[PDB]
RNA sequence: AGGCGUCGAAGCCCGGCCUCCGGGUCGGGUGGAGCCGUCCAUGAGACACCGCCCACUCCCCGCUGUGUGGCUAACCCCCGAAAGGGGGGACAGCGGUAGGUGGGCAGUUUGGCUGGGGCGGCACGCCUCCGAAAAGGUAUCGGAGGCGCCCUAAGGUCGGCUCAGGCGGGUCAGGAAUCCGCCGUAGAGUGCAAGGGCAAAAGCCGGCCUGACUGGACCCGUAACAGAGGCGGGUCCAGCCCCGAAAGGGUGGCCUAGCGAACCCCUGUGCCUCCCCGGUGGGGGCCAGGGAUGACAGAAAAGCUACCCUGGGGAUAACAGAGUCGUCUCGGGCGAGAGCCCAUAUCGACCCCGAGGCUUGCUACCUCGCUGUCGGCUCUUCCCAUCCUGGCCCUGCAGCAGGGGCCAAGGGUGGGGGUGUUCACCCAUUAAAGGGGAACGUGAGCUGGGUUUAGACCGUCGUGAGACAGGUCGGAUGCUA
RNA sequence: CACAGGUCCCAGCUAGCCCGAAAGGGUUUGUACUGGGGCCGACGCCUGCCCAGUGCCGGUAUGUGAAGCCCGGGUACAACCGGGUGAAGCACCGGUAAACGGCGGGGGUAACUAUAACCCUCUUAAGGUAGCGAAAUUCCUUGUCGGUUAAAUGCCGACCU
RNA sequence: CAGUUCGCUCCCGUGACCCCGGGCUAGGGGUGAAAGGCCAAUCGAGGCCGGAGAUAGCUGGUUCCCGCCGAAUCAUCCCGCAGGAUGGCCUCCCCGGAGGUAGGCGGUGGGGUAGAGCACUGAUUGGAGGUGCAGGGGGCGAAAGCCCCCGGCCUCCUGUCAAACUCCGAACCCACCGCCGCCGUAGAUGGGGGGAGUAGGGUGGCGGUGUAAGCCGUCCACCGAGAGGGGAACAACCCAG
RNA sequence: GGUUGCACCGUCCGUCUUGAAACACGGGGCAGGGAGUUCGCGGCCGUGGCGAGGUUAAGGGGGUUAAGCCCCGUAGCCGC
RNA sequence: GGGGGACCCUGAGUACCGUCGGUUGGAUAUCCGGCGGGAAGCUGGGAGGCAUCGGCUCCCAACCCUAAAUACGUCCCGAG
């Protein structure tokens, strides 16, 4: 699936239609400073069995696209609706 | 599951304990303070059969008045005179420091360290060969075929242990085996793990065959070391 | 673009040296005044000079760890009451911490539907047609198929055009290349299954564009009537926009599938907040998008039990009973044909209509707080679709015998070999050595050989515990009516 | 089941194997003709091929590999992020089958008709040798032939599918 | 006689033999010539007491009378299928005040079943006519070709079809409006609250499935939860509540 | 009122179950015992007090043979 | 009994930091214990719910004792 690299669309901050670059969100590892990770590491310590579920090989064949659109004028990013599912995602300058 | 015979042996129950009251006593050398820098002569008084020793024993009465039990070497004579010390003649029945035994001689009852009392080569029909004599160590070839280094001051006796050749004659009878092993309280008769129950042995089961390779790792925990333990190889070479 | 030089330079001699022995650096010595480039070539200029450097290398000082060798003084081992002596030795042992291995030892899981259960399959999440009974709804391991995608165009809008197939005519050119005329209600096409809808289009070819957007309402469906987290769809208000002359159209794909809670985490975007106040780092919170649970309204999860135990179930199997007769056994209708001619002496194709409950099967209606199995022995009784014994009819019935059929159930229908066998096969006799019902008659009558526990062996399958409607040896039968 | 006999494995002593929370202890008043651990199982003749798979043993140049330590960033200090060092273990290489276990298939085969027997070649490590065979192993099965009986789902001998 | 005995028969009887007294090994432990055997009539983990009145969706039981109304076994969800929750159906109390509709007549709309039919899509016997049609095979001819048939494709006639066909099409069912009838101010339609039970249904008519029995839905009539009079007895059939 | 005769009718009791006289389970007789209890929280209804207020808790005093009886007790809780 | 001082004293393997186990509502912010580190000490030190800096407030650990209001009933009066 081809997708334009840039598109003209509404900007919540400029309150008008401006040129927006198309970007893909880059997934990041869990932060060890977060409260959830802190609690997980706190309960992992000591004796006992594993305290959480351990899913194995539980992945969707195709994942939805998590795209952000950045305004070329104000430089802020936003989301445009909900993502869709395509196995091949390509960005074309058109 | 249940315990193995080897595990149960570790608890020292009467089923597995040595009956160390039928025997003639412990066989150890005279204290090193008597042997060092002084040679004593002793007279052999009697030669006896120790129930569990695998070798005959003998009583020696020393000049100083000490009565001791020793492992009689082949050819020892009742009423014979033996010597223990650094200045004793090289002969059968005499005990010398390892540094004073010419190379190529057969010795028995070798002390691991000077004065311990003798630990090596005490079974009937065994001997060790004195190979080399160095200021720091004396090399001796043991019955297993290993060249071990001993401190020069270790004490050993010249000759061979009497009673060799037993294995030439078959036991023939299960009753003969019964008496032999009862003399020492060694576990007999012995069962087979493959014909044991699965609860009792790793190889147990209704189908009489091990379900796993019989070579067990050296890192296996107690209750798992059965069969060939840490075997480099198996079969007929 | 000038720099060096008694602030001692060119041109030869060898000495040590590194090194692509390219070629360069340098101590000593006769030496006593000269040597490069701006000039040009090189993509990038000076071995003119002043500086930070990168690429290998060694050396002096300081620190830091690793490996090896050695020492004894901690520590360990032996002798000895002790004294003390000997051996090992900063290892080992011990304490703390970090990873691996680990059925040696434990707690657990190993789902459900199911014409019993298991194997099989998913009827376990969705979409179309029929079932479905002309409003709505309606089930089965009912029938026939599809989905777990793809598309920056296959999305929005505006303009223009009309398809499949056929006929007649044309250079290569034929069945099919590329054309010209006519007929042509869609017999074409739609991104994809099916259904429906679409012809001056929703199809085909072009122009511009991103409404496949932001902040929110009400309503229908999943889920009728009649409750719903999540999800999908419809009608609108505002913002900023796309197309068009304008009306008018645009909140993805012509409508119906292509997907998913809590907790946690990632990202965007602005705000609130963190224990007496204030700042900094960091944390928490509200809103939006995303990572998946297919057992698809969302536990993370392998088997044996024949040593088994418990609570139940005739809601559910094996024997027997009950319903049915597909199958089984036994009759009938028609008559092609075979029988020297002759359909019916005898056989009787291809078709069709029945009887019994004596084989097997199907169902799951009674019986799982217990109705003891196959076979044999003993004993009693009944049916005729009759094997012999009594009496008859037809005959392709000379006699002796045969083939078909009718009435007839009073009597008989026996003895042995292998095999647990019923049965079947075989032997010698006989008039014949008929088939069946009675809880597959009969274990409060017997026997216990087979079957179906607990022991054991072989073959095969399984890593294993084990399993085998595969063989094989052994394996209890209660009673005072 | 055991048994005498066979053979394999660990261990030179503060060992090997084992009980335990530890202290200490069993084998041990022991010392390789010994102690401990498996399998077969008197006696006679013999025990063939295979190390790819699982297991065990040795090496481990190289990759990965936890904490600790070091370096840079970050924090007025930490939390935190990136890199270096990196043991055991795995990856990797070799031995090992009286360790667990395996020892098929075709292309074919010709000469006489079947037979195909010697015999040559490929999938993966090798393609079942000496022996025994309808067997406590054989489905078809009451296999076939011979003996035993008048009659043989039995028994004995043989054949090999 | 005995919670393992008695008789006959049988086996060992100088050895791995039989027995006695004093000792040690204790429960995931002991002991075991290996049978999961034995460990005080108990052993695939002993006995005693305590946790403990353990838990179970599984089985059984639950005690006085009369009076009034009176069900359900069917939809969605659950490791759900012998169990639960939300609904539907029952009962009791209260607010509201002017309507409501099980039956019928007429009208305005919707439908695609039974039946029928070939106008589409797919099947179907034969005959006639037209088409060289990549058919195909033969006669004919060195070769290019014609002439025969058979086949394919169209029109017609003839003889037959469809749960996943329809050019047509009822009975009949549903929504709404007017009216008759009935109910309702002694308070309906409707709204709020309290308490449930019900999640195995059966017979009968119809539809899909099956050789049939049967299985699975649908219709709400009867038994379940129903007396009396009959069918000889009979759940379900007739009269009757 | 006890027993008995005649005519007609009538296949016990409890229980699971669609279905019980059942060849389905519990049923020799009699007497006695025997199974929706208590607390905490919450939703409702029947009645009574007060009312933009309501109500005390622990505890204190008086009196009493007595734990009965009288008064105080606003912390606290709910509502506005 | 009161005023002044510029001199002296005021608890160490302790407080505290890192890590591991247990425990706790204690949540980066409960308490106890092990291991490895470890001060100031009056010109001093500690607490104020993640860490650090400044202000403010409140305190002086690492030594010891303490009646009454309370828990119980083998037992004794009294009551239902
Ligand atoms: Zn902007």
PDB file of C-alpha atoms (C1' of nucleotides) in Angstrom, chain E residues 78-161:
ATOM      1  C1'   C E  78     -19.987 -17.076  30.781  1.00  0.00           C
ATOM      2  C1'   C E  79     -13.474 -23.223  30.565  1.00  0.00           C
ATOM      3  C1'   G E  80     -20.711 -22.420  29.685  1.00  0.00           C
ATOM      4  C1'   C E  81     -23.492 -27.443  28.677  1.00  0.00           C
ATOM      5  C1'   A E  82     -26.233 -31.625  35.793  1.00  0.00           C
ATOM      6  C1'   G E  83     -24.077 -24.593  37.285  1.00  0.00           C
ATOM      7  C1'   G E  84     -24.933 -19.102  37.094  1.00  0.00           C
ATOM      8  C1'   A E  85     -26.281 -13.543  35.344  1.00  0.00           C
ATOM      9  C1'   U E  86     -29.502 -10.191  32.268  1.00  0.00           C
ATOM     10  C1'   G E  87     -34.333 -10.560  30.006  1.00  0.00           C
ATOM     11  C1'   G E  88     -39.247 -12.973  29.045  1.00  0.00           C
ATOM     12  C1'   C E  89     -43.596 -15.424  31.900  1.00  0.00           C
ATOM     13  C1'   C E  90     -46.053 -15.098  38.232  1.00  0.00           C
ATOM     14  C1'   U E  91     -47.323 -12.585  42.641  1.00  0.00           C
ATOM     15  C1'   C E  92     -47.821  -8.223  46.503  1.00  0.00           C
ATOM     16  C1'   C E  93     -47.887  -2.750  47.494  1.00  0.00           C
ATOM     17  C1'   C E  94     -48.000   2.237  45.652  1.00  0.00           C
ATOM     18  C1'   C E  95     -48.456   6.683  42.113  1.00  0.00           C
ATOM     19  C1'   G E  96     -51.337   8.468  37.287  1.00  0.00           C
ATOM     20  C1'   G E  97     -55.932  10.123  35.551  1.00  0.00           C
ATOM     21  C1'   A E  98     -58.880   9.113  29.948  1.00  0.00           C
ATOM     22  C1'   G E  99     -57.797   5.775  27.573  1.00  0.00           C
ATOM     23  C1'   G E 100     -56.954   0.730  25.604  1.00  0.00           C
ATOM     24  C1'   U E 101     -57.549  -3.178  21.742  1.00  0.00           C
ATOM     25  C1'   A E 102     -57.571 -10.390  22.114  1.00  0.00           C
ATOM     26  C1'   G E 103     -62.322 -10.550  18.121  1.00  0.00           C
ATOM     27  C1'   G E 104     -64.953  -8.367  13.659  1.00  0.00           C
ATOM     28  C1'   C E 105     -66.403  -4.927   9.099  1.00  0.00           C
ATOM     29  C1'   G E 106     -64.374  -1.441   5.363  1.00  0.00           C
ATOM     30  C1'   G E 107     -60.050   1.202   3.650  1.00  0.00           C
ATOM     31  C1'   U E 108     -54.595   2.713   2.870  1.00  0.00           C
ATOM     32  C1'   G E 109     -49.678  -0.088   2.433  1.00  0.00           C
ATOM     33  C1'   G E 110     -45.956  -4.501   2.699  1.00  0.00           C
ATOM     34  C1'   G E 111     -45.212  -9.609   1.116  1.00  0.00           C
ATOM     35  C1'   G E 112     -43.274 -13.700  -2.913  1.00  0.00           C
ATOM     36  C1'   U E 113     -45.142 -19.193   0.310  1.00  0.00           C
ATOM     37  C1'   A E 114     -48.847 -23.172  -1.951  1.00  0.00           C
ATOM     38  C1'   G E 115     -50.241 -23.456  -6.969  1.00  0.00           C
ATOM     39  C1'   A E 116     -48.665 -22.490 -11.906  1.00  0.00           C
ATOM     40  C1'   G E 117     -45.146 -21.330 -15.833  1.00  0.00           C
ATOM     41  C1'   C E 118     -40.589 -21.049 -19.071  1.00  0.00           C
ATOM     42  C1'   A E 119     -40.293 -14.557 -19.839  1.00  0.00           C
ATOM     43  C1'   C E 120     -33.948 -14.894 -17.026  1.00  0.00           C
ATOM     44  C1'   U E 121     -30.343 -19.101 -14.798  1.00  0.00           C
ATOM     45  C1'   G E 122     -29.624 -23.990 -14.920  1.00  0.00           C
ATOM     46  C1'   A E 123     -31.642 -29.076 -16.650  1.00  0.00           C
ATOM     47  C1'   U E 124     -34.453 -32.073 -20.763  1.00  0.00           C
ATOM     48  C1'   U E 125     -36.649 -36.912 -25.794  1.00  0.00           C
ATOM     49  C1'   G E 126     -37.139 -36.695 -30.780  1.00  0.00           C
ATOM     50  C1'   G E 127     -38.031 -34.015 -35.566  1.00  0.00           C
ATOM     51  C1'   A E 128     -37.634 -29.781 -39.234  1.00  0.00           C
ATOM     52  C1'   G E 129     -35.003 -25.364 -41.085  1.00  0.00           C
ATOM     53  C1'   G E 130     -30.471 -22.132 -41.084  1.00  0.00           C
ATOM     54  C1'   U E 131     -25.338 -21.623 -40.288  1.00  0.00           C
ATOM     55  C1'   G E 132     -18.229 -23.911 -42.176  1.00  0.00           C
ATOM     56  C1'   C E 133     -18.419 -23.199 -37.390  1.00  0.00           C
ATOM     57  C1'   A E 134     -10.416 -23.897 -34.604  1.00  0.00           C
ATOM     58  C1'   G E 135     -15.796 -28.731 -34.811  1.00  0.00           C
ATOM     59  C1'   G E 136     -13.971 -33.676 -36.353  1.00  0.00           C
ATOM     60  C1'   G E 137     -13.722 -38.104 -39.716  1.00  0.00           C
ATOM     61  C1'   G E 138     -14.147 -39.882 -44.624  1.00  0.00           C
ATOM     62  C1'   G E 139     -14.569 -39.574 -50.549  1.00  0.00           C
ATOM     63  C1'   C E 140     -11.922 -36.179 -53.726  1.00  0.00           C
ATOM     64  C1'   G E 141      -7.662 -34.291 -55.471  1.00  0.00           C
ATOM     65  C1'   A E 142      -0.009 -33.397 -54.866  1.00  0.00           C
ATOM     66  C1'   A E 143      -2.546 -30.545 -52.545  1.00  0.00           C
ATOM     67  C1'   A E 144      -4.492 -25.854 -52.808  1.00  0.00           C
ATOM     68  C1'   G E 145      -8.789 -27.483 -52.399  1.00  0.00           C
ATOM     69  C1'   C E 146     -13.924 -28.942 -52.806  1.00  0.00           C
ATOM     70  C1'   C E 147     -18.372 -33.271 -52.034  1.00  0.00           C
ATOM     71  C1'   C E 148     -20.321 -36.258 -48.060  1.00  0.00           C
ATOM     72  C1'   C E 149     -21.687 -37.285 -43.347  1.00  0.00           C
ATOM     73  C1'   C E 150     -21.355 -36.721 -37.800  1.00  0.00           C
ATOM     74  C1'   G E 151     -20.793 -32.997 -34.192  1.00  0.00           C
ATOM     75  C1'   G E 152     -21.240 -27.529 -32.328  1.00  0.00           C
ATOM     76  C1'   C E 153     -24.444 -23.127 -32.319  1.00  0.00           C
ATOM     77  C1'   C E 154     -29.371 -20.466 -33.318  1.00  0.00           C
ATOM     78  C1'   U E 155     -35.381 -20.476 -34.665  1.00  0.00           C
ATOM     79  C1'   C E 156     -39.698 -23.531 -34.503  1.00  0.00           C
ATOM     80  C1'   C E 157     -42.595 -27.970 -33.375  1.00  0.00           C
ATOM     81  C1'   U E 158     -42.916 -32.024 -30.059  1.00  0.00           C
ATOM     82  C1'   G E 159     -42.371 -34.429 -24.623  1.00  0.00           C
ATOM     83  C1'   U E 160     -40.686 -33.183 -19.572  1.00  0.00           C
ATOM     84  C1'   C E 161     -38.331 -30.004 -14.640  1.00  0.00           C
TER      85        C E 161
END
